[PDB]
Sequence to fold (283 residues):
Amino acid sequence: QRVTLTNADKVLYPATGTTKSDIFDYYAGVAEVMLGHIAGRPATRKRWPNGVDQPAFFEKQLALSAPPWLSRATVAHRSGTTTYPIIDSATGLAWIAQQAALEVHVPQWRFVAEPGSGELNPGPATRLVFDLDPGEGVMMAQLAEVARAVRDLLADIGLVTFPVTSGSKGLHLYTPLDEPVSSRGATVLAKRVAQRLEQAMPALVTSTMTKSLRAGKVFVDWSQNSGSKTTIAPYSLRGRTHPTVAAPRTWAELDDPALRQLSYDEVLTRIARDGDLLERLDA
Ligand SMILES: Nc1nc2c(ncn2[C@@H]2O[C@H](COP(=O)(O)OP(=O)(O)OP(=O)(O)O)[C@@H](O)[C@H]2O)c(=O)[nH]1
Ligand SMILES: [Mn+2]
Fold:
């Protein structure tokens, strides 16, 4: 289990001078809190080899050159088969940094080992996710109000919801599923939540993607519960002008109208103070 960090001094975020080495330091720093929420999941790497002012790609297939110690599993998609890495150790996060994989994206299900053969196949959804996107003119205050409304509807079912500022423009919400549920079943439940909210507050919420009608509304994207979709991992850096993070928040923080995205240094400071706000999500 060995990684050599090359171009450690290469700036990946020109705006802030943040380097590959800084990204390595960050991922080392968040390893203990981040690994639980990506354990057992295929990791998709969004890479910016020349930094955030240069092109990115969304890399799913594991390269032939990938180190032999990386855990991996295969997924049959509608075209064929893809081998993914599974990130489950500090060394794995060191590899992520070396790859300039600023963002780590995962589905809401984990691999499960076969009864007799120990072969890894996709298992049930372990959590629901909601991806909340602000339409034009929509401020953080409205995103937070809609997030509370999602939380309340799920609370009517005895489900708990954890808020995450995405690091980009919106909010992500996670709710742990106590009993096993298929990704199909998860997508149905999430869609019904979204639709219920849109019916209750059609001027403030939409459950459909079409952008012509998104202005003034929060689009509550329920579709990333699909087995074939991903959502950025909690604690992931973002490939944006600033090295912001998909940062777990408290509901009390969401009562602040000045609510904003957090930078990676802030997230480290918060972990030092409070540990993992998502500790109960994948326990
Ligand atoms: N195919 C593909 N999917 C992507 C790519 N980048 C992100 N995704 C996925 O597309 C969806 C939206 O991702 P993003 O655009 O990063 O949105 P976000 O993290 O919710 O950030 P904001 O909406 O800006 O707050 C998620 O399902 C991601 O896993 C990409 O380059 N290619
Ligand atoms: Mn979004």
Summary: The longest strand covers residues 120-134. Residues 93 and 116 are 31 Å apart (CA to CA). The chain has two domains: 1-124+263-274, 125-262.
